[PDB]
């Protein structure tokens, strides 16, 4: 699948011979102030190989100038957090998905 | 955009979209380009919602 997920975080191969298990958990890990512990990677240099975890705290360069320790004007931090609040409806609740 | 970041250091570039380098990797067809001048004390409230 093409999108924010399954293209930079966890891409699944064409053949898999298995499936996922998903259920609603809006009280075990969802808090009124927003559970910021869960976060995703937004920006990557290229695509992701199937079944390949990638962890990196480095900044992804997004311009001509090479961003080494400066970010905000040209380059972004690749990690963005989740605003997991119970005040939303059903399209933004944290779903506990295990494959 | 190569010729974009040679116009003095900026003030604020927080974004909720795509990277400038993948703007080169993804070819577009329509972008809005509008500008205005505001006092510096009244730029911080320019945000969605």
């Amino acid at each position, epitope marked *: 699948q093409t999108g924010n997920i399954a293209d930079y975080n966890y891409k699944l191969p064409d053949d898999f011979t298995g499936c996922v298990i998903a259920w609603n958990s809006n009280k075990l890990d969802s*808090k009124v102030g927003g*559970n910021y512990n869960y976060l995703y990677r937004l920006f990557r240099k290229s695509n992701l190989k199937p079944f390949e975890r990638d962890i990196s705290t480095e900044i992804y360069q997004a311009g001509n100038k090479p961003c080494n320790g*400066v970010a905000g*004007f040209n380059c972004y*931090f690749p990690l963005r957090s989740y605003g997991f609040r119970p005040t939303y409806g059903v399209g933004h609740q944290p779903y506990r998905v295990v494959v | 955009y190569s010729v974009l970041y040679n116009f003095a250091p900026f003030f604020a570039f927080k974004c909720y979209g795509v990277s400038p380098t993948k703007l080169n990797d993804l070819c577009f067809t329509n972008v809005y380009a509008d500008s205005f001048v505001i006092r510096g004390n009244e730029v*911080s409230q320019i945000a969605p919602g």
Partner: antibody
Amino acid sequence: VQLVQSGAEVKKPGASVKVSCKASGYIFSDYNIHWVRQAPGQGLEWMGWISPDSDDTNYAQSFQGRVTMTRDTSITTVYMELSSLRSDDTAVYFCARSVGYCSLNSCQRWMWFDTWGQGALVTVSS
Amino acid sequence: PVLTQPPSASGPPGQSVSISCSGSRSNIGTNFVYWYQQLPGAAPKLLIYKNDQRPSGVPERFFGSKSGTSASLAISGLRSEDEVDYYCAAWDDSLSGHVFGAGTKVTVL
């Protein structure tokens, strides 16, 4: 919400001092707490954060072995103590509650101290 | 480590004065900057969060941001509440914790 805490008084050096913070109004199961110190005429200092619903803890790179942790969920309080107090430790302590919830190392970026607790100046001398 | 700030900065009322907050490679620039003010003999409170916005109860008068490896704060109008001190705060990875500033004192002329 209101963040009353009970201070201490002058004490002999090298003893143990007990200071606690009280949580009222908001539910004390979803918000991390933060403890800071303020010497007179000196900037604030960070030590660590304590989760209310878990026994997770973390300490700074300078204050590791001289600080412990105690939780009281039924009383709905937090308990902290200082061991081997120093002469240059007469600093006011603030019970600061951070918005959101974090337990990982990298979650500290999006955290700001929303509300603060009033503190009492505790100086250790005999 | 610590953040280098001027010990004091003063200006006449009716105009705008600026406060600088320098930082290292890991202290600021790769992270977000927050500012705290404290009344004398009271508790500190939040001033600017997420580098641009302000919480409820704080008017549009307060203003602060960052450009490179340094941050700047600007105020406009010193009548009764801008005589307090200000602090510059950020996060780094060397100390694995919050590193705060030294302290900036603002008076009136």
